[PDB]
Amino acid sequence: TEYKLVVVGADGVGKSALTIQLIQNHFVDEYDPTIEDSYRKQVVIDGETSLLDILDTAGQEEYSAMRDQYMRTGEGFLLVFAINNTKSFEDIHHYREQIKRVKDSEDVPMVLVGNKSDLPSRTVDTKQAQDLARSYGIPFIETSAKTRQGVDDAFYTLVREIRKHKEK
Numbered sequence: 001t002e003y004k005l006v007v008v009g010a011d012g013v014g015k016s017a018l019t020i021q022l023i024q025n026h027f028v029d030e031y032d033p034t035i036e037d038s039y040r041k042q043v044v045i046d047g048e049t050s051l052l053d054i055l056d057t058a059g060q061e062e063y064s065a066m067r068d069q070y071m072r073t074g075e076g077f078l079l080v081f082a083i084n085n086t087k088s089f090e091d092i093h094h095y096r097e098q099i100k101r102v103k104d105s106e107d108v109p110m111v112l113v114g115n116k117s118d119l120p121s122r123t124v125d126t127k128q129a130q131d132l133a134r135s136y137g138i139p140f141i142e143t144s145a146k147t148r149q150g151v152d153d154a155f156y157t158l159v160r161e162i163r164k165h166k167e168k
């Protein structure tokens with residue numbers, strides 16, 4: 001099965017670092033902050049061979065019709081913030097609403113991802129993120145793209161959310 005996964009959130013939260021951890025199994029310090037691109041990873045998840053096509057979003061904020069239609073083809077979304085950046089957490093509502101807007105649905109597979117969990121300079125409490133994810137009805141996964149903590153869990157959980165959505 002193929003899955004179109006989309007990684008969204010504010011600049012600097014670690015979308016590209018998370019993506020490259022999944023694709024290449026290491027931490028890329030410098031990934032061009034402006035570049036939006038996609039990558040495939042083939043993996044077996046709960047016994048099913050899965051082709052994950054991951055869109056790592058970036059670039060200028062714009063809402064062209066092409067862009068709405070492209071985002072609408074995403075099947076599941078990682079809502080990424082960084083635990084050291086409160087503005088990135090406050091921006092999660094916006095990304096969730098843009099997904100709901102283009103998919104014309106209140107029920108889109110999503111996972112809330114609190115990245116940079118290796119850093120000591122926390123300004124977003126785990127409880128804040130758990131409360132937000134509970135209010136959205138979605139899982140919350142703590143990650144570090146630096147150490148790889150939680151990375152497979154975030155992507156595989158999103159795949160499991162898509163499978164559950166298909167059966168509703």
Ligand SMILES: C#Cc1c(F)ccc2cc(O)cc(-c3ncc4c(N5C[C@H]6CC[C@@H](C5)N6)nc(OC[C@@]56CCCN5C[C@H](F)C6)nc4c3F)c12
Nearest residue numbers: 008010011058059060061062063064067068071094098099
């Ligand atoms: C993603 C996505 C996205 C979706 F998931 C779903 C559907 C979408 C349909 C669209 O047509 C288009 C998008 C889409 N594309 C790019 C965005 C973006 N950029 C600028 C920077 C920060 C990330 C990256 C890309 N580089 N930024 C903000 O918002 C930033 C803030 C801060 C300044 C003002 N805005 C409004 C809020 F306050 C938050 N939204 C964006 C957005 F919705 C969509």
Ligand SMILES: Nc1nc2c(ncn2[C@@H]2O[C@H](COP(=O)(O)OP(=O)(O)O)[C@@H](O)[C@H]2O)c(=O)[nH]1
Nearest residue numbers: 011012013014015016017029115116144145146
């Ligand atoms: N310590 C730490 N740094 C991170 C982590 N994820 C990303 N970074 C760093 O944060 C910056 C922004 O990461 P990037 O992947 O470009 O974020 P993007 O703009 O969301 O694609 C870079 O300096 C990364 O090396 C993480 O989990 N831990």
Ligand SMILES: [Mg+2]
Nearest residue numbers: 015016033058
């Ligand atoms: Mg990036």
